[PDB]
Amino acid sequence: LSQAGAHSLTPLSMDVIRLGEKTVIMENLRRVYKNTDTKDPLERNVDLT
Amino acid sequence: AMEANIFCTFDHKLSIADVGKLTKLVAAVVPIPQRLHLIKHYQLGLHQFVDHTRGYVRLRGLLRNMTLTLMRRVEGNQILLHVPTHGLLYTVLNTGPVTWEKGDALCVLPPLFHGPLARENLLTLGQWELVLPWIVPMPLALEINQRLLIMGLFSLDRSYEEVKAAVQQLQTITFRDATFTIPDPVIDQHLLIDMKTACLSMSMVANLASELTMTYVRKLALEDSSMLLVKCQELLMRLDRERVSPDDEIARLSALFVMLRQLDDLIREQVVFTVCDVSPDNKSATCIFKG
Amino acid sequence: MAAMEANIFCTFDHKLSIADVGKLTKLVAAVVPIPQRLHLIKHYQLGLHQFVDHTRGYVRLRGLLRNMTLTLMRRVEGNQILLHVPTHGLLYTVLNTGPVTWEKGDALCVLPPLFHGPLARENLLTLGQWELVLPWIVPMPLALEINQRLLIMGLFSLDRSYEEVKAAVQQLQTITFRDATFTIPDPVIDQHLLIDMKTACLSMSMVANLASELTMTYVRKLALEDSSMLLVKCQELLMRLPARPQHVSPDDEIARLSALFVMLRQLDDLIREQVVFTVCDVSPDNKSATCIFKG
Amino acid sequence: FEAIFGTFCNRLEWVYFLTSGLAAAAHAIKFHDLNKLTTGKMLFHVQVPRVASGAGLPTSRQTTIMVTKYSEKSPITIPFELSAACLTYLRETFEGTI
Amino acid sequence: MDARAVAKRPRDPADEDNELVTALKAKREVNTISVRYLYHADHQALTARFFVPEGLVEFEAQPGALLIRMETGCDSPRHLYISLYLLGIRASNVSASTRCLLESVYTASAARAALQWLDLGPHLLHRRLETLGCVKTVSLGITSLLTCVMRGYLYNTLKTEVFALMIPKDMYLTWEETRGRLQYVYLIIVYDYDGPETRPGIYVLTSSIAHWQTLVDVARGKFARERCSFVNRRITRPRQIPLCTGVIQKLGWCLADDIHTSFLVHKELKLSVVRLDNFSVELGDFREFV
Amino acid sequence: MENWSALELLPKVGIPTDFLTHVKTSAGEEMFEALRIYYGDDPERYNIH
């Protein structure tokens, strides 16, 4: 599976945080759900009893 | 490579509001008197057949000989008409008051009304008018004629208002998601001549059955081994419970069969469509064709 | 196995005369029923002729013919024939071997032949002590009455003198419908009629039971006020013998009618036949016409 | 007169899962014959290290353990209709009128 | 108009490019979606999806089974769908051993309610039912979905496999020792009228006969007993009018030679069934007979 | 009732848009006066006359 990956690469700008001396990506998904007719999976709810 | 389509041309000039009045009726059954290639708009619809004294039953029969045809496309001048081919699917407008659902055995019936409607509006040239027949589901289509025939049997006696209370019940069939009020075929107490014939078409048959059966059952009873005929005479002898030249028998039997051929128009009903998917809000639904 | 072939080749083994090879060219595009449904049927199975019998039961031919698959004649050539079976609902042309003037817009049904009278029988086409027999195509009003006349002939034959039956068979065997005269070959009584008379005699009784009291009475009551030609001519056939209805129950009455329609279809169908054609625009020659609903 | 102005049409904001940062959690790989396959699997071979025991205590076995890890299909499909009038106007062409 | 234009051979759609290709060809744009071959491009068969409750998906999950709409006087659902096999718990024709057997599998919050709707009123079952066709490729969702075949052969997509119709052995019967090279299939409801209750009597009846007149005549031999029950119910019960001894209607046709016995398998509960093979669908309107 | 059919055939400028609460809802609250919605391709746009 590791050898199946394409070797092509391109830059793209991103926001990142450095925690635990480890990089972590930040990324909104608002652009891919705005003006569409399905609920965003990240926005959910809890039923406390 | 385009599919064949009948052409049709209106004569009276149309305003742009009128040609747009017709584009709202893309899919729509349109009876055609004969499979002519050209056709005047006067031939379209049942409106050329419209009559006063002639009854609904006359529309019930001539419509069976009409060639149903969808309006595949609407433009200026010429109007296309796509005759269905058996076994292909065809989208059709739900002009019928009944809501459609999956798998209905739709069959055409002439349009009806109960006085003024919320929207009688249709395409209207001078004097000329269009009439698009209902596409009722089959089980209701039996219920229509079963009411229309019984209502004329009481037409001889409108004088008893207690009978009218039964006519008021038959007048308003109540299929689900519908509130019909079937018009009385009778007008000013007098019957239509088509109604007078349809009532004669049945009552004459039942009268001959009461007496003609008494003879032929006798000779045919002993020969039968199934015995089912032997008990048929029992109800006939109990049908008496209430209170001749050989040539006369031939003319008497001869009427009994020919009247049923006249009555057959009201009995068996061809199905013209069977539903598949239904569009939202039931504006229309596709239906595979079936002659 | 392959689905039964739409294309069927029939090849004679007997020698064909030059006079007869052109007889089939005039026969092109006509109903030629077959039974076995082979891809290469022999002509001995071709035609109705194999079903003939010394009884000559015309009612017997009426039933056995319906089981045979219909075919359309096509592509005459040198000692080769190509029958074809149209799929249901498609339109194709059909020549009329019979002598009847077809109308536009009427349904048609296959029927066993009825000899015209003179029975000149054309060249009839024969070989090997065998003759081709193609059943006639007829309009519905002729197709309907031809069955009821066979049935009423069997009712009068019962319960009456055999010499009296001949007086009724004579007037009934003739048919003057649509200009041309017709006559029924050997209308022999048969067990096939005995079951046909059975379903009619069964319907003859139950419809009297299913009929509503307001239904059978209605014709006798209409004469009290209305008068018309149809009311008088029909009233004479009936036996010689205001007021309230005894009861009016709309739910009970609508139920009586719905059952009554079923026995009518049980009774009407015996004079009905499986419609096959729905002709549109007949050709001016009246030697050919287009057809739909074939099969 | 009424005054119609310029016409407008919104353009969609193009997006790609390969460009999105959620792909850092993904490892996408095309495979044209994927419809033919039933279910994938990934066998894992494991042998745990052991420590020497003291006197009077049971000793650890040379333990070995293996597991299988399958896969989950998630098919997706999107309808879109095209009018039959668009079909008859797509390839058929009458006179070259404007 | 040109004489060469009528000399041209009739068009072959396969030689022509798909319309999705012709549009891309002019702008020479390349979409990621495949365009070279539209699927379901060549199917005379027509289909429509039928959402179903998940308590009836069993046995229907096997391709090839009859489906019928069952109209309900309730406004929701107005038309619960019914399996041909689930229908047999009510039919008297099914063997008492088989009836107790399969019924344990079909029990559900939904399917058990369907049996109650056959007892709600006097009206006969044939009025309440309407044949739909047969399933191919079940979706098997939490809300079950089925691709019924309105007409034509049952088969897997791309013609990779031809699904066969499945019919229970308890309902199947043969009218003749000599099967023809072709024979039509007929679903046929029958009613053996009786005092306390009029039981349904379902039967599947393949036959070489096709004409309606010849078919009903031979039908009266096997069913003469139920025919005797009909008139018997009339004479016993004045002011009572039962109707229709039964209903015949066309269902399709089969090659006859392909027929052979088979069996369904589910929940370690095998059930032997007749197995029609290349059953092209040809639905027919109900035709009552007395 | 404006002639919507002309808008579906006449060339149009491509303007990206940003607005709250989704176009299906903002037109579901009738923020605009005249408006029209439909599913799928519109046959009516092809009926030039």
Curated annotation (Swiss-Prot), chain A:
Subcellular location, record wording: Virion; Host nucleus
Top-level taxon of origin: Viruses
Function statement: Self-assembles to form an icosahedral capsid with a T=16 symmetry, about 200 nm in diameter, and consisting of 150 hexons and 12 pentons (total of 162 capsomers). Hexons form the edges and faces of the capsid and are each composed of six MCP molecules. In contrast, one penton is found at each of the 12 vertices. Eleven of the pentons are MCP pentamers, while the last vertex is occupied by the portal complex.
Annotated family: Belongs to the herpesviridae major capsid protein family.
Oligomer status and interactors: Homomultimer. Makes the hexons and eleven out of twelve pentons. Interacts with triplex proteins 1/TRX1 and 2/TRX2; adjacent capsomers are linked together in groups of three by triplexes, heterotrimeric complexes composed of one molecule of TRX1 and two molecules of TRX2. Interacts with scaffold protein; this interaction allows efficient MCP transport to the host nucleus. Interacts with capsid vertex component 2/CVC2. Interacts with the small capsomere-interacting protein/SCP.
Protein name: Major capsid protein
Gene name tied to this protein: MCP
Full-protein residues shown: 344 to 392 of 1370
Curated annotation (Swiss-Prot), chain C:
GO cellular component terms listed in the entry, alphabetical order: host cell nucleus; viral capsid
Protein location: Virion; Host nucleus
Protein name per Swiss-Prot or TrEMBL: Triplex capsid protein 2
Role noted for this protein: Structural component of the T=16 icosahedral capsid. The capsid is composed of pentamers and hexamers of major capsid protein/MCP, which are linked together by heterotrimers called triplexes. These triplexes are formed by a single molecule of triplex protein 1/TRX1 and two copies of triplex protein 2/TRX2. Additionally, TRX1 is required for efficient transport of TRX2 to the nucleus, which is the site of capsid assembly.
Similarity comment: Belongs to the herpesviridae TRX2 protein family.
Assembly notes: Interacts with TRX1 and major capisd protein/MCP.
Organism: Human cytomegalovirus (strain AD169) (HHV-5)
GO function terms (MF aspect): structural molecule activity
InterPro entries registered for this protein in UniProt: Herpes_capsid_2 (IPR002690)
Top-level division of the source organism's lineage: Viruses
Listed Pfam families: Herpes_V23
Coiled coil: none
Keywords in alphabetical order: Capsid protein, Host nucleus, Virion
Curated annotation (Swiss-Prot), chain E:
Protein name: Triplex capsid protein 1
GO process terms (BP): viral capsid assembly
Signal sequence range: none
Function in brief: Structural component of the T=16 icosahedral capsid. The capsid is composed of pentamers and hexamers of major capsid protein/MCP, which are linked together by heterotrimers called triplexes. These triplexes are formed by a single molecule of triplex protein 1/TRX1 and two copies of triplex protein 2/TRX2. Additionally, TRX1 is required for efficient transport of TRX2 to the nucleus, which is the site of capsid assembly.
Subunit structure, as described in the record: Interacts with TRX2, MCP and capsid vertex component 2/CVC2.
Family (UniProt): Belongs to the herpesviridae TRX1 protein family.
Locations listed in the record: Virion; Host nucleus
InterPro entries to which the protein is assigned, alphabetical: Herpes_1
GO MF annotation terms: DNA binding
Annotated keywords: Capsid protein, Host nucleus, Virion
Primary localisation category: virion
Entry annotated with the keyword Membrane: no
Gene Ontology cellular component annotations, sorted alphabetically: host cell nucleus; viral capsid
Pfam families according to UniProt: Herpes_VP19C
UniProtKB/Swiss-Prot annotation, chain F:
UniProt subcellular location: Virion; Host nucleus
Family indicated by similarity: Belongs to the herpesviridae major capsid protein family.
Functional description taken from the UniProt entry: Self-assembles to form an icosahedral capsid with a T=16 symmetry, about 200 nm in diameter, and consisting of 150 hexons and 12 pentons (total of 162 capsomers). Hexons form the edges and faces of the capsid and are each composed of six MCP molecules. In contrast, one penton is found at each of the 12 vertices. Eleven of the pentons are MCP pentamers, while the last vertex is occupied by the portal complex.
Subunit relationships: Homomultimer. Makes the hexons and eleven out of twelve pentons. Interacts with triplex proteins 1/TRX1 and 2/TRX2; adjacent capsomers are linked together in groups of three by triplexes, heterotrimeric complexes composed of one molecule of TRX1 and two molecules of TRX2. Interacts with scaffold protein; this interaction allows efficient MCP transport to the host nucleus. Interacts with capsid vertex component 2/CVC2. Interacts with the small capsomere-interacting protein/SCP.
Name this protein carries in UniProt: Major capsid protein
Source species: Human cytomegalovirus (strain AD169)
Gene expressing this chain: MCP
Residues of the full protein shown: 1 to 49 of 1370
